[PDB]
Design a protein around this ligand. Structure first.
Ligand code: X1X
Length: 308
């Protein structure tokens, strides 16, 4: 029972997925690297398979500085606590993987890290991600006529609903752990997600039709509560940042390399039908005003212009 006050230091982690998903692998890598680097003793207890909830639960736990110490979070699942952070990977921000890489390789997102720590008391310790989010639906959704009034789940950050509303869909902010049933019972027609999570959680079972809208390339901060991070001894803080950086690099090389491979696995297995979206590039035009407006609202117009 008895731990070190800031025998061992115990850091609790959470993942929504099993051991086969890139996020869980990234968190394992993080734990491995802290152990390698820290001339000291630390114990990690990673709770998998969504045993501790989903990201909307995790972010409140980290803000409170209890329950869990570290995890990975989507920017658009953190909007309640830091309204600017969804800019980090909002839909249609990145042109392609090269663009996305040029961002994560810089320190250009620093202002958003700073806001998250100041407003939400959550410390970014590295970046994973690299999945490409596409529409996944019960029936094919392949034209703007199909998309008009298309009922779909979005994450809760305002920008997600605003983007898909601009594309003429009917977005709904439904909990991630309720999506499968909401589709299966016809409440919504689909959602949007990247290959690795679709495969790992078997969302193809209810939504077999994937449309290549390629509307987000994920940026997924590895996060520790500010309360825990700031409590750690100074040498361990520095190790956590180095470990986090390297683990993020590992995770995003991994997920980005596997994304197309996993789409093909699901096609080959007869689990997904993959379709292009007709006149997809018209989406870029339609989405600009919403993007510009959001950046202006949060006072990040200069930061957005840079990224583009
Ligand atoms: O849509 C979600 O809430 C989740 O989708 C995937 O599992 C991940 O990208 C996760 O971070 C979150 O975005």
């Amino acid at each position: 029972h008895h731990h070190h006050h800031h025998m061992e230091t115990v850091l609790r982690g959470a993942s929504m997925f099993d051991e086969e998903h890139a996020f869980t692998k990234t968190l394992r890598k993080f734990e491995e690297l802290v152990d390698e680097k820290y001339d000291g003793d630390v114990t990690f207890d990673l709770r998998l398979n969504g045993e501790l909830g989903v990201e909307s639960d995790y972010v409140t736990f980290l803000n409170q500085g209890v329950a869990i110490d570290y995890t990975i979070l989507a920017p658009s699942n953190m909007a309640k606590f830091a309204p600017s952070i969804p800019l980090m990977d909002m839909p249609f921000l990145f042109r392609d993987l090269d663009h996305w890489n040029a961002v994560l390789s810089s320190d250009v997102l620093a202002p958003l890290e700073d806001e998250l720590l100041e407003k939400a008391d959550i410390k970014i310790v590295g970046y994973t991600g690299g999945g490409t989010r596409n529409l996944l639906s019960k029936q094919p959704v392949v034209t703007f006529d199909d998309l008009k009034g298309h009922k779909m789940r979005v994450m809760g950050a305002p920008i997600q609903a605003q983007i898909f509303q601009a594309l003429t869909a009917a977005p709904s902010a439904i909990a991630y752990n309720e999506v499968y049933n909401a589709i299966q019972t016809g409440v919504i027609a689909g959602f949007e997600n990247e290959a690795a999570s679709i495969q790992n959680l078997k969302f193809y079972e209810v939504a077999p039709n994937l449309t290549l809208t390629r509307h987000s390339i994920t940026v997924r901060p590895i996060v520790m509560s500010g309360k825990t991070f700031n409590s750690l001894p100074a040498d361990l803080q520095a190790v956590v940042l180095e470990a986090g950086e390297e683990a993020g690099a590992y995770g995003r090389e991994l997920e980005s390399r596997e994304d197309g491979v996993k789409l093909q696995e699901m096609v080959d297995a007869g689990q997904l039908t993959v379709s292009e979206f007709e006149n997809r590039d018209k989406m870029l035009e339609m989405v600009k005003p919403v993007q510009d407006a959001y950046a202006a609202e949060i006072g990040a117009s200069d930061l957005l212009e840079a990224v583009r």
